[PDB]
């Protein structure tokens, strides 16, 4: 009997991200870290 | 034997600074995004922008401090 608790439902994951968008600032200087967080991973693993 | 003592410490100062810089927690800055030109034998290079640094980009290599 392992117990490795990780998973949330989709209702729980979408509740977190709205509060993640609540905790964030709504300007362009706070969503800039998100678009470059993925842009770093796009340059990192790419064929092109 | 001044030149021999000066020779035994010929690689102290690059080992203290150049060989080991950014092994600490707080790391960042900007770095060139240079790309290898994809025909490999041409050995051509192009500067293709900037790369903002983070703690996954700091050297995984051990510091040269202990030796």
Explain this structure.
This is part of a larger assembly, with chains A (48 residues) and B (67 residues). Chain A is an all-alpha fold and 48 residues long. Chain A has helices spanning 10-23, 28-44. The longest helix of chain A is centred in the C-terminal third of the chain and has 17 residues, at 28-44. With 67 residues, chain B is an alpha+beta fold. Chain B contains two helices and two strands; from the N terminus they run ααββ. Chain B has helices at residues 2-8, 12-18, and strands at residues 30-36, 45-52. In chain B, strands 1-2 form a two-stranded antiparallel sheet. In chain B, a hairpin with an 8-residue loop joins strand 1 (30-36) and strand 2. The longest helix of chain B is centred in the N-terminal third of the chain and has 7 residues, at 2-8. Chain A binds chain B through residues 36, 40, 43, and chain B through 33, 51-52, 54.
Strand portion of chain B, in percent? 15-25%
Number of strands of chain B: 2
Oligomerization: part of a larger assembly
Per DSSP, the total helix count of chain A is 2
Largest sheet of chain B: 2 strands, antiparallel
**Rounded radius of gyration of chain A (Å):** 16 Å
Number of helices of chain B: 2
What's the helix-strand series of chain A?
Answer: HH
How many strands of chain A? 0
Largest interface: A-B, 3 and 4 residues
**What would the principal axes of the Cα set say about the shape of chain B?**
flat
In whole angstroms, the N-to-C terminal distance of chain A is 45 Å
Structural class of chain A, by secondary structure, is: mainly alpha
Order of helices and strands of chain B: HHEE
Strand order of the largest sheet of chain B: 1-2
Judged by helices, strands and strand pairing, the structural class of chain B is alpha+beta
Helical amount of chain B? 10-25%
- Tell me the major beta sheet of chain A: none
CA-based gyration radius of chain B: 18 Å
Gap from first CA to last CA of chain B: 23 Å
Helix content of chain A: 55-70%
